[PDB]
Amino acid sequence: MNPPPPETSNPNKPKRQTNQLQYLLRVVLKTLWKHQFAWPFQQPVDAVKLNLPDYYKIIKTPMDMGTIKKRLENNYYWNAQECIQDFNTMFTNCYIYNKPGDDIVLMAEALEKLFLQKINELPT
Numbered sequence: 001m002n003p004p005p006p007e008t009s010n011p012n013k014p015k016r017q018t019n020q021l022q023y024l025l026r027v028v029l030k031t032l033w034k035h036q037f038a039w040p041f042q043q044p045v046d047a048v049k050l051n052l053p054d055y056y057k058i059i060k061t062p063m064d065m066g067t068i069k070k071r072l073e074n075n076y077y078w079n080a081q082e083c084i085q086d087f088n089t090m091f092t093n094c095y096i097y098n099k100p101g102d103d104i105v106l107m108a109e110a111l112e113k114l115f116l117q118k119i120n121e122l123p124t
């Protein structure tokens, strides 16, 4: 019931490093990672472990911060916007799979606010 986790490397896809991407790893991701509500989002959802047998029946573009971290470490992204889209997909997936007011959704909401605070201004 678990598909393979999202790719963190792809030899068909060009790599890049930018000041913004470096910041996304060093500052944004590594700070969000330490937040008290980061733990549900540090790895791909394991539907067997977590007893969420419909997770991947609902969520067709899964994403998590562990994957994002590995992508940043591997220079998988072309630019910061591509990485930002992955965070936004992670947050949106949470709102889609769950319901307003759920504890997991309150966690995602808090992390998304902090994320927006940190990406409001990126290095030039």
Ligand SMILES: CCCC(=O)Nc1cc(NS(=O)(=O)c2cccs2)cc(-c2csc(=O)[nH]2)c1
Pocket: 039, 040, 041, 043, 045, 050, 093, 094, 097, 098, 103, 104, 107
């Ligand atoms: C494997 C590390 C622990 C973990 O991630 N647990 C967990 C439990 C659960 N189920 S739970 O009832 O224990 C829970 C409720 C509030 C935070 S976790 C869900 C998720 C989840 C991540 S994204 C998403 O939509 N859900 C994650």
